[PDB]
């Protein structure tokens with residue numbers, strides 16, 4: 222942890238996970254101010270909006286923070302497949318007096334397909350830039366490192382970690398099956414090894430090269446200590462920060478995570494088009510069930526789901542929301558983010 | 572921290588997992604003599620054979636050991652379903668010039684359906700009796716405890732752990748998704764939460780009452796230390812002991828676990844009829860695929876598979892073997908069991 226904190230310029234080996242739709246400049250700044258590494262996610266925003274968000278964080282903290290971008294294979298539009306998916310969803314929209322959207326859009330541009338993102342990052346120079354779903358080309362990773370920036374990439378397997386090493390990243394974020402949100406699997410069509418945090422962190426620390434940031438299921442200082450025993454250099458925690466008042470989780474999401482539903486999470490591909498973990502609801506169904514048409518590509522599926530979420534929310538219905546949560550959800554606490562960071566550090570010290 | 576060792580009268584908080592077909596009286600005795608808790612599995616044997624196995628262990632050690640029994644819901648014979656399954660397997664049998672069996676047998680009697688097991692255990696009184704796939708009724712757990720036996724039950728979720736506490740067991744074995752072999756899910760028809768070790772151990776230790784024995788993915792002292800930081804009172808390790816000379820793993824299994832195949836494990840229900848983790852081969856296929864008929868009950872499916880294994884083996888083919896292994900398989904070591912136990916203790920102490 223001394224090595225990692227020195228590398229990142231921070232006091233504590235704790236990253237508050239970037240969480241699209243949940244992390245905020247206020248949350249990131251609170252964690253960075255408290256001594257960890259706060260994070261924001263800027264995928265889905267135009268580069269100049271991402272720039273504004275980065276500048277917002279800087280107006281709230283002097284300390285290092287992490288800017289996260291999705292690096293998936295660029296989605297492949299398929300109007301016919303998307304049409305059939307929308308037709309399939311039509312009765313759900315109709316419950317709320319709505320029709321499905323007339324077309325789906327590539328709402329989350331990959332780092333690999335939006336050439337305006339890299340130069341913006343090279344200008345703003347956040348302390349850390351992180352990638353999910355894949356690693357950028359080595360030359361782009363090097364460009365970021367050429368200015369101040371530390372580069373992290375998420376991996377879910379030793380094979381993916383090898384690719385992160387090849388990309389020249391400064392650290393690998395080892396995401397275990399416990400983790401909330403969309404899984405960082407590079408090529409899900411090849412399957413999902415679905416490796417638990419305890420095995421994955423040990424495997425990458427033992428037979429790997431880079432500092433390992435443990436992600437998935439860690440909710441308290443005991444979990445941080447366990448990750449460190451396995452050989453991690455730091456932890457990345459998402460679910461633990463969702464209930465912070467600084468996050469942009471809405472009231473229904475906070476209520477869900479605080480209550481009995483927190484007892485069980487599940488994986489779904491039907492929410493976004495990519496395997497993701499959260500509190501199961503009506504958007505969690507079997508994609509291989511009879512009558513269910515072929516799934517469109519990521520992220521077009523999520524565009525469809527967001528339209529349905531909008532229609533449901535317009536009638537006060539939250540049963541289609543994306544309430545992401547890891548397998549430690551039952552251990553969630555509701556605290557100001559700075560207090561949570563401090564509490565984690567006290568628990569880590571023992 | 573001495574919570575489990577004092578409970579069992581042993582020196583080290585390390586259980587060598589019971590492993591049907593792999594653990595032996597010699598393996599159990601080596602581990603118990605070295606200061607841990609050695610284990611044998613006696614399901615699939617008549618009670619008097621089970622008794623003989625227990626006496627074999629006692630012939631080799633005076634120290635505490637663990638005797639394990641399956642406690643699944645008893646399988647229901649279904650000739651039509653079984654005939655359909657055998658028909659589906661028929662071309663595999665034919666590949667090796669064999670016929671499938673005419674009938675499938677209930678080869679592994681549950682503790683719940685063989686009334687001769689409890690009286691035998693009450694007479695022999697091993698230090699620990701453990702159960703997998705379910706908890707016995709409270710009155711039977713009490714009967715065992717009444718003569719000084721410590722009762723352990725495996726759970727894969729907090730809900731199953733609650734049933735273990737209701738049954739009045741002395742300890743819960745928290746089996747995470749990392750674990751090798753058959754998963755201890757009580758009611759797999761309800762689905763499988765598939766909780767990773769790091770989350771599961773923390774959940775049971777943070778929110779439950781019983782001492783927690785961490786099982787799944789633990790291969791070295793760092794892993795043991797990690798489990799203790801999560802709040803476990805001991806660990807249970809299967810895969811780590813498979814390569815010990817004292818085990819009854821055959822040569823193909825040992826070579827498989829030592830070789831490149833150890834880099835990947837997966838789950839299959841088509842081998843035994845219950846979800847199980849091992850090194851994938853031809854018995855690892857999607858049971859929900861088009862053209863695949865309904866699975867017979869556990870353990871009838873395993874009877875079918877064993878017949879196929881026999882036929883394949885006769886032609887020198889090992890691609891249908893049950894080579895169980897957890898997600899830490901790449902970290903397996905080959906040592907005399909007593910030497911492995913000493914190494915683990917050295918690593919644990921730091």
Ligand SMILES: Cc1cc2nc3c(=O)[nH]c(=O)nc-3n(C[C@H](O)[C@H](O)[C@H](O)COP(=O)(O)O)c2cc1C
Pocket residue numbers: 238239240241243262289352353375396399400401402403436437438439457458459460461463544545546547548549
């Ligand atoms: C609500 C939510 C949103 C998330 N959003 C992102 C994201 O936008 N980008 C990313 O790389 N990871 C995201 N993650 C995953 C985290 O980076 C991390 O893998 C995960 O939170 C660790 O598991 P935990 O929730 O048990 O701490 C998200 C996780 C959650 C729960």
Ligand SMILES: Cc1cc2nc3c(=O)[nH]c(=O)nc-3n(C[C@H](O)[C@H](O)[C@H](O)COP(=O)(O)O)c2cc1C
Pocket residue numbers: 588589590591593612639702703725746749750751752753786787788789807808809810811894895896897898899
């Ligand atoms: C080959 C093998 C056989 C096993 N047999 C049994 C068994 O007969 N009864 C039981 O309760 N658990 C059995 N287990 C599971 C262990 O009790 C334990 O949950 C598991 O080994 C822990 O995961 P690990 O292999 O990563 O250490 C077996 C595991 C393996 C790998």
